[PDB]
């Protein structure tokens, strides 16, 4: 199997600016017949992928000329002059030269803005939930940027691991930020077995990791 590695996993961009996504293949995609079957697709949330560029530089029918492709053997590049809102999504490169057709891992084009530290909130489990044998502790990181954040849980100062799940929203349309929730789940007994519950958020926008906490339970 041939491997296609798309360099920019995520590409922050300002509207109107140029975007450049890279694709590198394990082997030369130069078929022995001459052609180089390296194509580019864009897939938007909830939608099926869409062919943009084929055979390195050929724009498929209907595709805006601001989209262009280059490259020759194992290295290829897709460029988008003047990025538009409708251009935001995941770009996949794909090869059809070798045995089984393979796709790159995808590059997410996103809106680049200023750094925003998250607003951190912590919620203890409700009495109604505890009353059912479970205890969920929720840590909220509100409207931050970039997406990278670090939320470490601590129960009576002991660092937790493996007992939490976190969800993240898509970049906000108005302010271009992200929000994230981290849920720490414990049995009621284990929950009532400790004092302080705290989530420590460490984001590029904070001067030093911030931690919010409570201690009942």
């Amino acid at each position: 199997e041939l491997v296609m590695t798309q360099t920019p996993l995520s590409l922050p961009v300002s509207l109107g600016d140029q975007a450049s996504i890279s694709c590198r293949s394990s082997q030369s995609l130069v078929h022995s017949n001459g052609n180089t079957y390296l194509h580019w697709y864009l897939q938007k949330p909830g939608q099926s992928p869409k062919l943009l560029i084929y055979k390195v530089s050929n724009r498929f029918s209907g595709v805006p000329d601001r989209f262009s492709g280059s490259g020759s053997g194992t290295d290829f590049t897709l460029k988008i002059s003047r990025v538009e809102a409708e251009d935001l999504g995941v770009y996949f490169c794909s090869q059809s030269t070798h045995v089984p057709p393979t796709f790159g891992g995808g590059t997410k084009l996103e809106i680049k803005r200023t750094v925003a530290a998250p607003s951190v909130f912590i919620f203890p489990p409700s009495d109604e939930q505890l009353k059912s044998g479970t205890a969920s502790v929720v840590c909220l990181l509100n409207n931050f940027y970039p997406r990278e954040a670090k939320v470490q849980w601590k129960v009576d100062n002991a660092l937790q691991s493996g007992n939490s799940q976190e969800s993240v929203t898509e970049q906000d349309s108005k302010d271009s930020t992200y929000s994230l929730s981290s849920t720490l789940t414990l049995s009621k007994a284990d929950y009532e077995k400790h004092k302080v519950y705290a989530c420590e958020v460490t984001h590029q926008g904070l001067s030093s990791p911030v931690t919010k906490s409570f201690n009942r339970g």
């Binding site: 084929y54 794909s94 796709f103 939930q129 976190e166 929730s181």
Partner: protein
């Protein structure tokens, strides 16, 4: 048009069989190879194989030789994908893709059919409040939220104040718990001053179980 219309979403249990269809427009049916690609939640794109619309011969990718069957109904211009002895790992969105020989590209993609394999039984969620910081009432912006946990299957819809409240609202993507049950939280940032005057109710609806709950927070 190259139109490709796939069948509805499928909810299955391990070991069962599924048959997904893809109706294409005639007068071009035999002009493309009918490929199939899988996309597991947040995973890459995996080519499964294709079937010759001119001869009816399937070619399966190494990773899909065994429980997968490519078929066609040349009369109804319809292509089918069948997966037997279904596994959790089959949970994905399956695309029916028309491909052209010369360009060797994936020209038209179907909408994609979502298949969810699980042993879980339909279950309405439990809705718990995510109370705004009490020991910190007047401090600018308040927390506030609802934890909608342990439900199956997706989706769930959550509004606030019957829809009058949308700004600041962040409803996170569900997360599959180790129990095989989904859980999610919907939060909202309000002014601490509004706490006590402005009442907040999250409206949670789970159609699969015909469950509807309003929770004052």
């Amino acid at each position: 048009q190259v139109q490709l219309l796939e069948s509805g979403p499928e909810l299955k249990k391990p070991g069962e069989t599924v048959k997904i269809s893809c109706k294409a427009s005639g007068y071009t049916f035999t002009n493309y190879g009918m490929n199939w690609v899988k996309q597991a939640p947040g995973k890459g794109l995996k080519w499964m194989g294709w079937i010759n619309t001119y001869t009816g011969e399937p070619t399966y990718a190494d990773d899909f030789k065994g429980r997968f069957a490519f078929s066609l109904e040349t009369s109804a211009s319809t292509a089918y994908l069948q997966i037997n002895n279904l596994k959790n790992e089959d949970t994905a969105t399956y695309f029916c893709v028309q491909a052209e020989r010369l360009r060797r590209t994936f020209d038209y993609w179907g909408a994609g059919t979502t298949v969810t394999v699980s042993s879980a039984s339909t279950k309405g969620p439990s809705v718990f409040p995510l109370a705004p910081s009490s020991k910190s009432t007047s401090g600018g912006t308040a927390a506030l939220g609802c934890l909608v946990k342990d439900y199956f299957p997706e989706p769930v819809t959550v509004s606030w104040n019957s829809g009058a409240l949308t700004s600041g609202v962040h409803t996170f993507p569900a997360v599959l718990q180790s129990s095989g049950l989904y859980s999610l939280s919907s939060v909202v940032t309000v002014p601490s001053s509004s706490l006590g005057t402005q009442t907040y109710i999250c409206n949670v609806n789970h159609k699969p179980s015909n469950t509807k709950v309003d929770k004052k927070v």
